[PDB]
Amino acid sequence: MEFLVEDLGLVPYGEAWAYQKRVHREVVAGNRPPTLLLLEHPRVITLGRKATGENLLFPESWYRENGFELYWVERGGDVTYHGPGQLVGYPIFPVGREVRRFLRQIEEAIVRVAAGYGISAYPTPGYAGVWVGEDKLCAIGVAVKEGVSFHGFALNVNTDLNDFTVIVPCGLKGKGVTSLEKLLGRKVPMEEAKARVVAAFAEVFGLRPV
Numbered sequence: 001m002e003f004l005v006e007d008l009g010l011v012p013y014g015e016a017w018a019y020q021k022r023v024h025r026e027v028v029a030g031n032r033p034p035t036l037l038l039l040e041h042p043r044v045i046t047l048g049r050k051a052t053g054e055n056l057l058f059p060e061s062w063y064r065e066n067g068f069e070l071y072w073v074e075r076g077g078d079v080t081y082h083g084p085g086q087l088v089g090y091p092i093f094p095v096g097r098e099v100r101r102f103l104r105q106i107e108e109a110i111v112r113v114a115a116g117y118g119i120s121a122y123p124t125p126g127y128a129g130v131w132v133g134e135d136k137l138c139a140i141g142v143a144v145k146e147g148v149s150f151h152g153f154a155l156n157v158n159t160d161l162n163d164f165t166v167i168v169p170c171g172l173k174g175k176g177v178t179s180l181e182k183l184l185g186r187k188v189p190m191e192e193a194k195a196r197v198v199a200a201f202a203e204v205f206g207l208r209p210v
């Protein structure tokens, strides 16, 4: 019937990760409703299941020297970047066995958010995440353990898109990355993007937000 939204604001990746795991435990135990965490991270690169050292353009020592944190994680995908101005959403939801369906629902929610801004976005038949033309507006990479999801999505609102140039994803993809700011030619308030994401999730999943 319901999902809980928690706005964590700006939180370091490591502690936010530990929080994800604690939230996940409670949902698995049936002691917390499905939970959508909304937040930002300080500049961080994460390397998922498919990731290798060639997903990094520079040596990894360079990243830490230049203001990035770097972590190896168990989510789908290879490399991604999170940083200020990017709305990171961690839906920690009792999805069961239907992971592909859950991914499609996240995609749909993001497509709805973009539509609210007058932007035509699509999952694309062939590339993970949500795209506007040849550019990726939102990365998506989930993990599921004991039938409950963690990690999630990363919607570019006012992201510093220049920070993506130092990472080199592998596989089938479009040409670039984009943000609501870049597409609209002006910054979009983070509090507003959060509200619209909540509204979109409520609609797609058919749950009332608390």
Ligand SMILES: CCCCCCCC=O
Binding pocket: 075, 076, 077, 078, 079, 080, 088, 089, 128, 139, 140, 141, 142, 151, 152, 153, 154, 169
């Ligand atoms: C929380 C968003 C994670 C997105 C990871 C997708 C990377 C694709 O290869």
